[PDB]
């Protein structure tokens, strides 16, 4: 591949430069010792992120404020990176944004099934997943009104067309099912879009990483299977994204599995996920493998997949920042090193 | 029990924080108005301590367990269990306070 | 009295409600009112908190515990006023989002005074 410079060479270069300002392992360790909130803020100011720590007063300076500043930096950098690009890179960024927009639309669903004064949701909606019709859905009250505000003038319409008949949700949890249903539809759309419009090596990288994410969603669903009276295994197969690496040998068997014994046994059919179902923790190892995959995709250095790599790598970095800030400011030193810093 | 409501309550709060980190966002908005009666209740107090009918609340878990569980990632159940343990600590502290008043 | 469930309303931090409703919570489906009213984390005046406290601890007949965030060190006088009896609401002051269980807690203040 050589054509990539013609359309996203500048975008790739600036995204790589943004990657180079990640959390230095020594710097992160030094910040970890600086358990004091002010000391941690000073250390983070010493980090490449800049003078964000001095933007807010030390009085309100907390782990929540630190994560808010990190989210603001994420949103602004991602806004610049998508605004400076066009074409295939523009659509890729659009999709990335839709990933969080699914969750933001799910939050917008809250307040429709039960009146909830959507102003707080609008003020609290995740910025990276901003939707153009989000205020339009905010005004809509009835289920059909919100559905029209989402099936029309909102880009997520194909997902709400592949499922969500009348969007009643009288016996289907939004976050547990409806959010997972739209998430699965998004995962399928992403996978086929990568397979049909993204060149290699980014094509193969995107296929592998999307399979990883779909497998993560399937594993979470399987873990949540045993704690629900609803979500029958007939629905669980529907609940799965119907795509990914484990599909179909491990995905179908896990979906048919209902007892806890099926859960772990199913992950053993695949070599990559061996041990996650039998040791450690689901989410922590999920983030570990995701960061490793992001580094692997960033190694290619001349692919569209590098944008997704930096997205997910420094999403893991923001998760690590949350972990460290919480465990340091509020004094839980035992798992301060649970954060991943192999970037 | 007050210094437990410092330490152990911090531990349960960080259980919630780890669950949020797994979910990547504050699940508090979803948890809001999740269920009418979560899996816990306070039974009527009844006891007689040192000749006085001190009313220590013997709270017990609701039979309809996990009425608002099963949402998000796998850490939700662990956070629910940690919250139930902290709530048992809370019932103990409330019973001790009711004794310290009566 | 009868059985009931806890509530947590003190405007310092409502994240305690998020961290506790996973195991223990309270809403009134018959009354269509969430008994575990949020604290808004400082987004509401103390008048609404006082009104909710009066409704829960002086209008509700069903008796159970109640929780309060770091605002318990701010509304100590009202806490002493409503804490005259263990029922209907025996108050409590969890730490919430910051370590906020000093000697300034009203129950701890009474314990120290009688200590």
Swiss-Prot record, chain A:
Tell whether Chloroplast is among the UniProt keywords: no
Short name of any one Pfam family annotated for the protein: vATP-synt_AC39
Q: Has keyword Acetylation?
A: yes
Q: Which SUPFAM superfamilies match?
A: V-type ATP synthase subunit C
GO molecular function annotation: proton-transporting ATPase activity, rotational mechanism
| UniProt topology in membrane | Peripheral membrane protein
Q: Which InterPro entries match?
A: ATPase_csu/dsu_sf, ATPase_V0-cplx_csu/dsu, ATPase_V0-cplx_dsu, V-type_ATPase_csu/dsu, V-type_ATPase_csu/dsu_dom_3
| Membrane spanning stretches | none
Gene Ontology biological process terms, A to Z: endosomal lumen acidification; Golgi lumen acidification; proton transmembrane transport; vacuolar acidification; vacuolar transport
The family note in this entry says:
Belongs to the V-ATPase V0D/AC39 subunit family.
Name of the featured protein: V-type proton ATPase subunit d
Organism of origin: Saccharomyces cerevisiae (strain ATCC 204508 / S288c)
